[PDB]
Amino acid sequence: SLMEKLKWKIKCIENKFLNYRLTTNETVVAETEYGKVKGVKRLTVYDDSYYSFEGIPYAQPPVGELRFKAPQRPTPWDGVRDCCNHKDKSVQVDFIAGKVCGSEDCLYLSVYTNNLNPETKRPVLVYIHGGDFIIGENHRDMYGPDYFIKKDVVLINIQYRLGALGFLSLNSEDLNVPGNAGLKDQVMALRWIKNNCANFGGNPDNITVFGESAGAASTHYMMLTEQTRGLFHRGILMSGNAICPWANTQCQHRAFTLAKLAGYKGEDNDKDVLEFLMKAKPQDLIKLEEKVLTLEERTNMVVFPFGPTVEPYQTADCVLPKHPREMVKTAWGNSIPTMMGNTSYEGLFFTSILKQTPMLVKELETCANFVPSELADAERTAPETLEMGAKIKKAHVTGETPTADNFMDLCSHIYFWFPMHRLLQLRFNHTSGTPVYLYRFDFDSEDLINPYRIMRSGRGVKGVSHADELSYFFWNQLAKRMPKESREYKTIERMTGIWIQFATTGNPYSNEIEGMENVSWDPIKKSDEVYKCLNISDELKMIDVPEMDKIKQWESMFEKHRDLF
């Protein structure tokens, strides 16, 4: 809406001046393996303080011949690199302005801590942002460390290449563009963190990686790939994982289509296509991505044209040599403590889409288009496919006529709950007993929000949508100082506290977190038929996952196809 665009611009300006008033005149120098960096001490609105290093390069700028290639190690420097200000985000369409922004020069991470010379080495928490592999950033207007730095941790926020610039993939081995450049960026950042966190007070023997949405899929990929074996010690998957249907795609044939949209006049061979794309303006490629998917791919419900892919040939930096379902079977990360969770109304995220085209509710008449693609016939007309759709329909259509709320409830399961069930069950076959803990974020407030609520046209909407929990982990430009006694402030304390406790010990329970006294938070066992989770609302309560019945109804579609579950 034009009104929300104006209110956003106003908030951008007020936030810029708030950030000036939160900057002190105290700067500090830290060591890295590539040279010295200068950071600055900042305040929060709660009068905590932290040292801030932004714009630390973990790779060469991926420009010129390095476009579409795996990241290369950065060049060291003499002197002191200024890390007192942020760098640009990866080239992307701005989620509110509707225009391309960012730069190819985006391979940076930021480090935050309340004390550069602590008395004891600290848990290191590494956040990988979401945004469907096409948007996102580590700027503090979205991901402020202000809540975590209340406690004695080191927090690190990474960037990685997005869209076609991060995820182009070509079959021809001679061209060295196998795919997943953006995931390889994440690998290089994690290697930097392992080798450098001690210079900021961090414990390289106690690193936790976490992320939400595509950042959860990313964290999971970082737990699956051999490239990162042993680099970190706990993982937290917030509303996503690497076997979600939206988390990967085979995009090798789409480079030609993108080139044609950008003015390419030649034939479909990888060498000529790549040479054209190497000369194209990066803003043009990113703007045209919305047009890349063909009529057939849209019909088949492919979501994004470029993203994580199974790489077509092996390279030294290869991240995904097989489908993630197969990678789970040998994954090093199955042996580290893991926490997984979702919000209590994930699919509310699709509110504005159902407002744009209300006829989507007609998809619930047969639900044939929601049957998992590995179970469905090509036409989605086979009797078995319709009987599977009828099972989906009975799980989510609660009244005589399907409603938008029924549709959004279905979305919660197809995109989040069912893939998490499938992952837990697949993983129980390939782990030596390392614990996995479930949470359910169920705290609803409009007094502390984040920019995702604007994206989903969620003002005035009740329910705990996808990404609503981020307001309780990170300061952002729409946030405000909350009273100590407020339900929102308590939720910040609880969410950061649980994450820090888990990062420290691999067990998310602590009697020092308020309202967690009487909680017995046991991890999921292989023989459990019903998952339990810590439900986070105004109270903290262990419950059987309310979504279980529906999860089991989705699982029942595989009763005659157990090999595919």
Side-chain angles (χ1 to χ4, degrees), residues 1-355 357-516 519-565:
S1 116
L2 201 148
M3 176 54 153
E4 290 279 357
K5 273 168 233 154
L6 169 59
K7 300 163 84 144
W8 179 253
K9 190 72 207 84
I10 284 178
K11 274 299 200 185
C12 288
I13 289 155
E14 310 176 338
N15 189 248
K16 177 152 212 200
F17 283 88
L18 171 62
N19 288 334
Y20 286 147
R21 302 197 305 281
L22 295 179
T23 308
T24 79
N25 72 337
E26 184 176 329
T27 61
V28 63
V29 176
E31 306 297 313
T32 83
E33 67 184 302
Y34 300 107
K36 293 167 181 290
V37 293
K38 182 177 72 174
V40 63
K41 181 183 173 179
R42 303 189 185 277
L43 291 157
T44 80
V45 301
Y46 297 95
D47 286 319
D48 303 294
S49 63
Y50 62 101
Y51 298 92
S52 174
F53 302 81
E54 301 172 287
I56 302 178
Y58 65 78
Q60 299 274 348
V63 299
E65 199 92 278
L66 294 184
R67 184 190 280 175
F68 305 126
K69 306 294 195 305
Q72 308 300 307
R73 172 185 82 251
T75 298
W77 57 88
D78 289 308
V80 181
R81 169 181 290 275
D82 186 346
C83 294
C84 293
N85 287 299
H86 65 92
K87 284 290 213 182
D88 217 340
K89 68 186 63 185
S90 181
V91 188
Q92 63 191 264
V93 175
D94 184 85
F95 75 118
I96 284 176
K99 297 145 196 310
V100 180
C101 63
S103 166
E104 287 196 275
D105 185 3
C106 63
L107 298 189
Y108 297 97
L109 55 81
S110 298
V111 178
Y112 311 111
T113 176
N114 69 33
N115 186 349
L116 274 166
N117 300 290
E119 280 328 302
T120 193
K121 64 193 184 185
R122 294 177 166 194
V124 178
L125 283 75
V126 183
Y127 186 70
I128 308 184
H129 69 79
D132 294 327
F133 307 101
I134 63 161
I135 65 165
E137 64 284 305
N138 68 1
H139 301 173
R140 293 180 298 107
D141 60 357
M142 192 37 212
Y143 299 105
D146 304 52
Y147 304 157
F148 275 105
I149 58 79
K150 299 184 195 199
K151 296 301 195 220
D152 291 354
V153 299
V154 177
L155 178 60
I156 303 179
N157 291 71
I158 72 166
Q159 283 185 171
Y160 57 94
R161 277 173 284 177
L162 303 173
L165 291 171
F167 294 95
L168 206 84
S169 180
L170 298 169
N171 284 322
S172 173
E173 167 163 29
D174 276 352
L175 302 182
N176 203 43
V177 180
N180 299 329
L183 294 180
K184 294 163 189 179
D185 294 339
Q186 299 177 7
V187 171
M188 191 159 285
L190 289 178
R191 290 174 177 159
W192 185 98
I193 293 163
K194 173 76 176 176
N195 294 310
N196 291 276
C197 64
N199 299 310
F200 300 84
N203 181 356
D205 291 339
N206 192 35
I207 303 168
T208 295
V209 182
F210 72 124
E212 188 269 344
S213 201
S218 290
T219 295
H220 194 205
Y221 284 129
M222 294 303 105
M223 302 166 69
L224 296 174
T225 183
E226 289 295 326
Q227 296 292 346
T228 54
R229 174 174 285 277
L231 282 183
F232 60 96
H233 310 89
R234 294 88 169 78
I236 307 176
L237 309 186
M238 304 176 62
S239 303
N241 67 50
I243 67 166
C244 289
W246 49 262
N248 57 68
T249 188
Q250 294 312 114
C251 53
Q252 288 71 33
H253 58 291
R254 302 189 178 129
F256 171 64
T257 301
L258 173 65
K260 290 283 270 169
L261 286 158
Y264 176 65
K265 296 302 193 302
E267 301 299 300
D268 190 354
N269 70 82
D270 298 335
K271 191 267 217 183
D272 293 338
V273 165
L274 180 58
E275 293 184 337
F276 183 90
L277 292 176
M278 278 324 270
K279 304 169 199 193
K281 297 300 174 166
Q283 289 76 14
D284 287 352
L285 297 192
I286 292 319
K287 188 37 174 186
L288 289 168
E289 277 181 49
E290 32 193 281
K291 298 181 176 179
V292 166
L293 287 178
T294 68
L295 178 64
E296 184 65 23
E297 291 168 324
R298 298 193 308 261
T299 299
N300 294 333
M301 296 162 279
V302 175
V303 279
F304 310 101
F306 300 100
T309 199
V310 178
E311 299 176 45
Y313 58 89
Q314 193 181 336
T315 56
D317 301 308
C318 178
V319 168
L320 305 183
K322 297 188 170 176
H323 191 276
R325 284 184 53 92
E326 298 310 308
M327 293 189 62
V328 168
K329 303 181 180 180
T330 60
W332 74 267
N334 290 339
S335 300
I336 72 181
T338 303
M339 182 152 61
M340 277 203 204
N342 302 286
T343 74
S344 60
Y345 199 173
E346 290 275 357
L348 200 57
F349 200 62
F350 301 93
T351 290
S352 60
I353 298 173
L354 281 137
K355 286 185 181 188
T357 92
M359 287 300 291
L360 284 158
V361 190
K362 287 312 177 186
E363 298 280 353
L364 304 172
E365 286 302 320
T366 69
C367 289
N369 285 331
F370 302 116
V371 172
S373 64
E374 65 269 31
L375 296 181
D377 63 300
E379 285 67 67
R380 298 192 179 254
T381 54
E384 195 180 11
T385 301
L386 303 168
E387 157 205 338
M388 280 178 185
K391 298 186 172 178
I392 295 172
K393 189 182 177 178
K394 149 278 308 174
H396 300 286
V397 175
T398 50
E400 196 209 332
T401 320
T403 63
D405 269 328
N406 296 168
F407 187 108
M408 293 193 287
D409 182 51
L410 194 161
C411 288
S412 303
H413 284 263
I414 192 170
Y415 290 134
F416 305 103
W417 292 100
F418 192 50
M420 159 221 93
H421 179 46
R422 294 179 80 172
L423 174 58
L424 289 168
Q425 294 306 309
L426 179 65
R427 179 183 170 283
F428 274 132
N429 286 55
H430 309 285
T431 185
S432 79
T434 320
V436 53
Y437 294 90
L438 298 186
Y439 72 87
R440 184 171 182 267
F441 186 73
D442 187 31
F443 179 80
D444 193 8
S445 170
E446 268 206 86
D447 284 357
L448 188 59
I449 66 168
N450 74 68
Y452 266 113
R453 184 179 290 262
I454 313 181
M455 261 196 32
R456 66 178 171 92
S457 297
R459 277 209 218 261
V461 180
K462 301 303 297 188
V464 186
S465 176
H466 187 65
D468 274 356
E469 81 276 33
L470 294 179
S471 302
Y472 302 93
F473 287 104
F474 299 103
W475 174 264
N476 70 78
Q477 71 173 37
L478 306 182
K480 58 198 189 203
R481 183 160 68 215
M482 301 314 293
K484 277 178 39 124
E485 55 293 1
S486 73
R487 58 194 291 268
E488 291 83 8
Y489 183 107
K490 294 181 195 164
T491 301
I492 297 170
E493 294 185 296
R494 285 161 175 181
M495 288 316 279
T496 58
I498 293 165
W499 265 230
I500 291 166
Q501 169 62 24
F502 184 70
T504 302
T505 70
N507 181 336
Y509 167 81
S510 170
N511 63 7
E512 295 260 337
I513 295 158
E514 167 229 11
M516 217 187 195
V519 158
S520 188
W521 191 352
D522 297 316
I524 310 299
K525 306 299 170 341
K526 184 174 175 171
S527 53
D528 291 344
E529 271 203 278
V530 176
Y531 297 149
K532 69 189 61 116
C533 64
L534 183 74
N535 197 69
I536 299 136
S537 63
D538 286 79
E539 289 194 283
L540 301 183
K541 288 262 154 213
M542 282 310 300
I543 65 173
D544 286 338
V545 166
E547 286 79 9
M548 205 81 207
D549 274 4
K550 289 160 177 182
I551 288 169
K552 293 305 289 193
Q553 282 179 78
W554 278 76
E555 171 180 2
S556 80
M557 272 186 303
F558 291 84
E559 268 158 20
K560 297 172 177 171
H561 305 282
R562 291 289 308 181
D563 40 305
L564 299 183
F565 177 67

